Amino acid sequence: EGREDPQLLVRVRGGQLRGIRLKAPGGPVSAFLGIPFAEPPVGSRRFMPPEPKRPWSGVLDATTFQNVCYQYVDTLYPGFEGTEMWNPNRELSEDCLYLNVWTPYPRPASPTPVLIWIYGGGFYSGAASLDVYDGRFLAQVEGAVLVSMNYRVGTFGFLALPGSREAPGNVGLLDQRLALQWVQENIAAFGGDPMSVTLFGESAGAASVGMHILSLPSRSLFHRAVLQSGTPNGPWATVSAGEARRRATLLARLVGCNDTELIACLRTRPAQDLVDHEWHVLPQESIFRFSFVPVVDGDFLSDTPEALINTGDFQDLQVLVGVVKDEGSYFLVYGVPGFSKDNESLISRAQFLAGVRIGVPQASDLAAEAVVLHYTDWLHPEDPTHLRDAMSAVVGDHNVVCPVAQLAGRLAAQGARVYAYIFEHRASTLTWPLWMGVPHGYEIEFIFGLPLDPSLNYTTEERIFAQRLMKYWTNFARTGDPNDPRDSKSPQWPPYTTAAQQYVSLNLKPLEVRRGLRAQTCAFWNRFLPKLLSAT
Ligand SMILES: *[C@@H]1O[C@H](CO)[C@@H](O)[C@H](O)[C@H]1NC(C)=O
């Protein structure tokens, strides 16, 4: 050093880092990108828990994003921004265990509350370097210290021969925990306060967050939690040990393969062979179901998430949870016949019955009959527009809205302070059709404050809206309460309780308080539907 910027030189446990000064709309921020937190989980390390990164010599250049974890790349609509924005934006590699830090410039003298982003992508995709996860706005405008990590997805992160030593499962979750541990030890070097660490994530990221809540060794590494459109409970976020064992041996057979010998052989396969076959192991034709996800291993997860939330002590827990207006629409174009981004996707009653079997792939004939009965509008049972919207609701309710209601209910009843929302604003810049409404993941760009960038063509109301949400999120991170104590009655956001079931709408209009999160419909999914499949 000598002629470099004094604010960009930081030491952490493993060594020295040089960051980059980035431009945010209202001023500069500090960014430390591609900091390694684990030994590269390659070769013999594939499928194994991450080993902490051994110290390096010299000043590590931390000015660009690092590799994206090896994964399937979406190809449904080549060139289309609505799909591309989620696609990897750096080289794919198994050497991908890096994290990123954004802080104010110059970095704060007093310790700042830390926000840790965990991305979604169904546990088969995702990356902390996507444009919608850009922490520079939260860091600049709200003065937050923001951290995001890469964690292994797909087989690399989740293939499991439960019980075995060499592929124990949930190692993608262990990548996340390692980064949480890195934050406890090192974030103070950046002005972050390790005693104020808020986790937030969306979809599989939300479910990830939910699992750190449920896994005791993670609990001491954070203080509050936001779960956007995702939960550890529910039908897609976990598989049983038996089912993970089944999928893992099938996948092994498909690429050419005693647990030790199986895994040893899997380790000799190129990463791309594994990705090519990962979608061939699902039990049924389905949507919103993924091959390699967290397993109920009796270790990281001591029991099913359903069980752990029913019987858990959440006294000292503040939690913000919510959903978007149309949780189910996104995946309809991915495997329900009749649906497409290129038309209105008006469907027949026949396509609707078939859709229900794909969207509730684990339902018996009788349970699917129940779903169809509940969601049919018997005044117009053949109306194509209703049926299209009902198909979307079935998928969204079953996968997100009802797991979230279930989760919010159990947490509130068991000590937790819960705040709940529904996000209803459709980005003026959205490229998916109008019929898809506000699909899942399209609140994110607002929370991270992308509309503050003039070159992005968000409306002025959207720029103001984004700031409202950044305030809610960071107030929550700071205090456990999304409301601003200064600005009183504008109006208030009440906690969600089992008595009143209050939640707020998030849109361009001021906060509106509503009651019951699909209460009737969620009774169907959460109370009745299990008892039906518990007697078929
Ligand atoms: C933003 O604004 C200009 C004018 O409409 C347009 O040419 C450009 O493509 C827009 N960028 C985005 C993000 O679509």
Annotated catalytic residue: which of 30, 203, 215, 329? 203
Q: Indicate which residue's Cα is closest to atom 12 of ligand 1.
A: 456
C-alpha distance from residue 437 to each of 247, 275, 356, 434, 450 (Å):
34, 31, 20, 5, 20
Judging by DSSP bridges, how do beta strands 112-118 and 192-202 pair with one another? parallel
Q: Which of 116, 321, 119 is nearest to 199 (CA)?
A: 116
- Encoding tokens for residue 36? 């390694």
Residue 457 CA: which ligand 1 atom is closest? 1
Residues 502, 513: Cα–Cα separation, whole Å: 7
Ligand 1 centre distance from Cα of residue 33 (Å) = 28
> If you take atom 2 of ligand 1, which residue's CA is the nearest one?
457
Are 356 and 391 spatial neighbours (Cβ–Cβ below 8 Å)? yes
Nearest CA residue ID for atom 1, ligand 1? 457
* Atom 11 in ligand 1: residue holding the nearest Cα: 456
Tell me the CA–centroid distance for residue 456 and ligand 1, in Å: 7
Report in angstroms the alpha-carbon separations of 168 from 172, 241, 282, 523: 11, 10, 20, 36
277 assigned to active site? no
Residue 457, ligand 1, Cβ within 6 A: yes
To the query of whether residue 329 is one of the catalytic residues in this protein, the response is: no
Return the half-sphere exposure (C-beta side, CA atoms, 13 A cut-off) of residue 325: 16
CA of 75 to the centre of ligand 1 (A): 24
Please tell me which residue in 212, 277, 425, 440 is annotated as part of the active site: 440
Residue type, position 186, single letter: N
CA of 429 to the centre of ligand 1 (A): 9
* 340 C-alpha to ligand 1 centroid (Å): 25
Joined together, the tokens standing for residue 109 give 């003298």
Domains of the chain: 1-536 (3.40.50.1820)
CA 429 to ligand 1: nearest atom: 14
Task: Report H helices in 278-360.
Answer: 305-310, 349-359
Query: Gaps after which residues in the chain, C–N over 2.5 Å?
Result: 257
Q: CA distances (Å), 245 to each of 164, 166, 352, 471, 529, in order?
A: 10, 13, 33, 44, 26
The answer to whether the CB of 459 is under 6 A from ligand 1 is no
The CA-atom distances, in angstroms, between 436 and each of 327, 330, 528 are 9, 7, 28
Locate the ligand 1 atom nearest the alpha carbon of residue 456 and give its number: 13
SS3 at position 117? strand
* Alpha-carbon distance values, 380 to 337, 430, 435 (Å): 21, 31, 19
For the Cβ of 456 lying below 6 angstroms from any atom of ligand 1, the answer is yes
Beta bridge pairs of residue 421: 322, 504
Q: In angstroms, rounded to a whole number, what is the distance separating the alpha carbons of residues 498 and 410?
A: 8
Ligand 1 within 6 A of CB of 85: no
Instruction: Give the per-residue SS3 of 192-257.
Output: EEEEEEEEEEECHHHHHHHHHHHCHHHHCCCCEEEEECCCCCCCCCCECHHHHHHHHHHHHHHHCC
The verdict on whether 327 is a catalytic residue reads yes
Q: Among the atoms of ligand 1, which is closest to the Cα of residue 455?
A: 1
Best of 430, 456, 457 for a ligand 1 pocket test (most atoms within 8 Å of beta carbon): 457
Measured in angstroms, how far is the CA atom of residue 465 from the centroid of ligand 1?
A: 20
- Tell me the two tokens of residue 427: 């980005």
The active-site residue out of 94, 306, 327, 443 is 327
Maximal CA-CA distance, the chain: 77
Quote the ligand 1 centre to 459 CA distance (angstroms). 12
Atom 6 (ligand 1) nearest CA: 457
